[PDB]
């Protein structure tokens, strides 16, 4: 069951690149593609993410896409840059100028077919293709506008494969330009329709976690992206490693998504760590469990106590008692049973994998489908209409073909989405 990875634009390629570093280290694959690991657990499911090349080398099933040659050249120059199959670098030259319209309708249109061709070559190699996972941000133009255009086209060619994204939410605390709320509202409309699973990586939550909890006074994208690679390794654990679960994207979607549009997950991680500095006490299973449910460990700036958990998946990494995991997990439910819906019995599921991630002896990754994610979609809807009620900055988009109407629809679909999350917070 192969997965096809796609990373698009400045942000999607920078986090895209860290993911492949991180998990290439966990599977003992080095920057040349040669395996040098200890456990067989590292290669039993290597094919989910890697293609096996002649000479028994491993090549990520990764398609790298940008409207600009900038970041993508930095990937090729990066530590694992040589691991990526070079034919899979697809890129224009004009850039997308942080403009959703250029990504989706003008500039991205030129380039999308060439991306769809590399996607096709990869899919055909595939034995049983589960689907796709995309890394992008919603606040610029390539990953946001072109990214969702790809997602639309992939779903037309492969209507019955799973579509998974890692979508970075914009935030005034980490913002390139003032049109990010416009770009993200337009994308969120796309995502509600055309993905099975999206992980809401909020840059607001990454920022606070960097500032308040890691005490980083002035956090770079590299600090934010350390958090993003930790969560990304986490949520993909039960797909890359052998365990009792041995999950795939579809079973994941079936059990997490009770209603098709409510497929926006809050990720969470524990222990929160800051790059380089390693602390030396491992956590106790009770600590992982309290921290991982802690709002301070959520990667989407939502208060879980303001919503109800529709469903929950939790993944524990390291040598530890599955008895104490069972006990610590049963205890946080029955302590805070108010915050889980009664009408999906037994909606918290847990898995364990022996291999911990690099640097830590024990770790807990949290995947929550909480109705409190509406707080995110409200935050962005507020910034959206704060400008749109004055039609501010709109010309950047009417200049590339778009109509005011298209904004009213996207705005409207998102307010609908927030109403839908609100319906089940009372049910």
């Amino acid at each position: 069951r192969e997965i096809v990875h796609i990373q698009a634009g400045q942000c999607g390629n920078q986090i895209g690149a860290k993911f492949w570093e991180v998990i290439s280290d966990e599977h003992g694959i080095d920057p040349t593609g040669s395996y040098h690991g200890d456990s067989d657990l590292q290669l039993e499911r290597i094919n989910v993410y890697y293609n096996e090349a002649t000479g028994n080398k491993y090549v990520p099933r990764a398609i790298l896409v940008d409207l600009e040659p900038g970041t993508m050249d930095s990937v090729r120059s990066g530590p694992f840059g040589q691991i990526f199959r070079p034919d899979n670098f697809v890129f224009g030259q004009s850039g997308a100028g942080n403009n959703w319209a250029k990504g989706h309708y003008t500039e991205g249109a030129e380039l999308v077919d060439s991306v769809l061709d590399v996607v096709r070559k990869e899919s055909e190699s595939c034995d049983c293709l589960q689907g796709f996972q995309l890394t992008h941000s919603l606040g610029g133009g390539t990953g946001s506008g072109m990214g969702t255009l790809l997602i639309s086209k992939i779903r037309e060619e492969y209507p019955d494969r799973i579509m998974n994204t890692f979508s970075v939410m914009p935030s005034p605390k980490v913002s390139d330009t003032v049109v990010e709320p416009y770009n993200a509202t337009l994308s969120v409309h796309q995502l509600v329709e055309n993905t099975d699973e999206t992980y809401c990586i909020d840059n607001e939550a990454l920022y606070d976690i960097c500032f308040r909890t890691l005490k980083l006074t002035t956090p770079t994208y590299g600090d934010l992206n350390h958090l993003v690679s930790a969560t990304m390794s986490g949520v993909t654990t039960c797909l890359r490693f052998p365990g009792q679960l041995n999950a795939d994207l579809r079973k994941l979607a079936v059990n997490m998504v009770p209603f098709p549009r409510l497929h926006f997950f809050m990720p969470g991680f524990a222990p929160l760590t800051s790059r380089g500095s390693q602390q030396y006490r491992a956590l106790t299973v009770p600590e992982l469990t309290q921290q991982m449910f802690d709002s301070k460990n959520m990667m989407a700036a939502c208060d879980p106590r303001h919503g109800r958990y529709l469903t929950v998946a939790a993944i524990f990494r390291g040598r530890m008692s599955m008895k104490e995991v069972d006990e610590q997990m049963l205890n946080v439910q029955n302590k805070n049973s108010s915050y889980f819906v009664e009408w999906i019995p037994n909606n918290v599921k847990t898995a364990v994998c022996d291999i911990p991630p690099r640097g830590l002896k024990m770790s807990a990754t949290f995947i929550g489908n909480s109705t409190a994610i509406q707080e995110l979609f409200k935050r962005i809807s507020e910034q959206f209409t704060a400008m749109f009620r004055r039609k501010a900055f709109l010309h950047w988009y009417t200049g590339e073909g778009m109509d005011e109407m298209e904004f009213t629809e996207a705005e409207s679909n998102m307010n609908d989405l927030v109403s839908e999350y609100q319906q089940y917070q009372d049910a």
Binding site: N255, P258, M322, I344
Partner: protein, 437 residues
């Protein structure tokens, strides 16, 4: 002699099938390559074990088994396991994409493309049978393959073999070892569509097996191999009469005759004692009366419920080991006084007893200790309807919001089959409650 074909469906079906077939081989002295030293009718026989095995011109003993999983991972471990030589490649049928815990995906979408290939390898086995009795079908209620493909298979079998019996061993869904939140949808759906196609079904609630494994085996977090070795013990107990000399439950029709007076209410409760840990160095061997009494304790039942608050319509005691009729009747008489055993008025209060002198077999290096005598009670008590209420409540909770329904409709199914399957279940709980008040 009349042959019986075993069909193992889904992960739960296949892994339990492995557990059983390995146990069978131990009990019948067959080896991992299918050579049975003790068989002297080489390349044939109408012995009693020949109901579950065929012989080969080269004297191999081959399960009358078909394994079928919508996905290759589990049946592959069979294809490469200690008993790889036992089975014949075309009896291990695997798909490529599984049902994703989706009743509708296993029944309609992926079911339709394999239902023919499967009924063909099945008929390839029915053709080496001189007088086929019918089928033993092993499956989970919860898995999409377990629930959805099984009811599509059950429907065709009723068609191609209208005269042969079909018995079920069904794993009922328990949250502790459960992988999916939609198991109650799949359970109701598959019960409704299988009800009139199954002659007798033995439910095994994973909750009950799990706690027997913790309590009586001192296993902290029971694995599937813990639960499956214990579950095949019970299965062996229930099938021994088909595979051994005897006069009770000699054919699959007797199971319906002895345990199923009304045809819908065909879910006999199984109780098993004694379950004794192999780590216990010093164990005092339990008596006929002690182990017959353990059959009326809920903590030994395959499903947790309270038979005191229901009524019986039938009862079998299946003993294995050092047991004589006199000890049984003294233990029955002693127990009758102290226990609350109420039959329906149209049924005689009384037990059909069966004794096999070969004591239970324990796979070397398992968790069960050898014991001098064991027993497995099969009782058709209305108190098992408790499990239907549990399952049906969980289903009403999700379905009131129509949570997850879209996954099903999106494969073909109609919201209607949901309420239709739930009304059958509502019929079923009313049937039970009639009989038991």
């Amino acid at each position: 002699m009349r042959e019986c074909i075993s069909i193992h469906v889904g992960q739960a079906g296949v892994q339990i099938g492995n557990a059983c077939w390995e146990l069978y081989c131990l009990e019948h002295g067959i080896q991992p390559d299918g050579q049975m030293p003790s068989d002297k009718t080489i390349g044939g026989g109408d012995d009693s074990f020949n109901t579950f095995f065929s012989e080969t011109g080269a004297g191999k003993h081959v399960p009358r088994a078909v394994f079928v999983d919508l996905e290759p991972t589990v049946i592959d471990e069979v294809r490469t396991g200690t008993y790889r030589q036992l089975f014949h490649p075309e009896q291990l049928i695997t798909g490529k994409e599984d049902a994703a815990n989706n009743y509708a995906r296993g029944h309609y979408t992926i079911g339709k493309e394999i239902i023919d290939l499967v009924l063909d390898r099945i008929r390839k086995l029915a053709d080496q049978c001189t007088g086929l009795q019918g089928f033993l079908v092993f499956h989970s209620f919860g898995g999409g393959t377990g629930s959805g493909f099984t009811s599509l298979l059950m429907e065709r079998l009723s068609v191609d073999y209208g005269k042969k019996s079909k018995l079920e061993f069904s794993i009922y869904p328990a949250p502790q070892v459960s992988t999916a939140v939609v198991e109650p949808y799949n359970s109701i759906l598959t019960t409704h569509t299988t009800l009139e196609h199954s002659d007798c079904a033995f439910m095994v609630d994973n909750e009950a097996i799990y706690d027997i494994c913790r309590r009586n085996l001192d296993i902290e977090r029971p694995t599937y191999t813990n639960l499956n070795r214990l579950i095949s013990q019970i299965v062996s107990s229930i099938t021994a009469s088909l595979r051994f000399d005897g006069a009770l439950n000699v054919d699959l029709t007797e199971f319906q005759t002895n345990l199923v007076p009304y045809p819908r209410i065909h879910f006999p409760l199984a109780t098993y004692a004694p379950v004794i840990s192999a780590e216990k160095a010093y164990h005092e061997q339990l008596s006929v009366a002690e182990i017959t009494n353990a059959c009326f304790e809920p903590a030994n039942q395959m499903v947790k419920c309270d038979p005191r608050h229901g009524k019986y319509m039938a009862c079998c005691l299946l003993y294995r080991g050092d047991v004589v009729p006199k000890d049984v009747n003294a233990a029955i008489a002693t127990i009758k006084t102290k226990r609350s055993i109420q039959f329906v008025d149209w049924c005689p209060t009384g037990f059909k007893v069966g004794i096999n002198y070969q004591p239970p077999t324990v796979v070397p290096g398992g968790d069960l200790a050898k014991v001098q005598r064991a027993v497995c009670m099969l009782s058709n008590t209305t108190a098992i309807a408790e499990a239907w209420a549990r399952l049906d409540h969980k289903f009403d909770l999700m379905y009131a919001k129509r949570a997850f329904v879209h996954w099903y409709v999106g494969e073909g199914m109609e919201e209607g089959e949901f309420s239709e399957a739930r009304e059958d279940m509502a019929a079923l709980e009313k049937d039970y409650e009639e009989v038991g008040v």
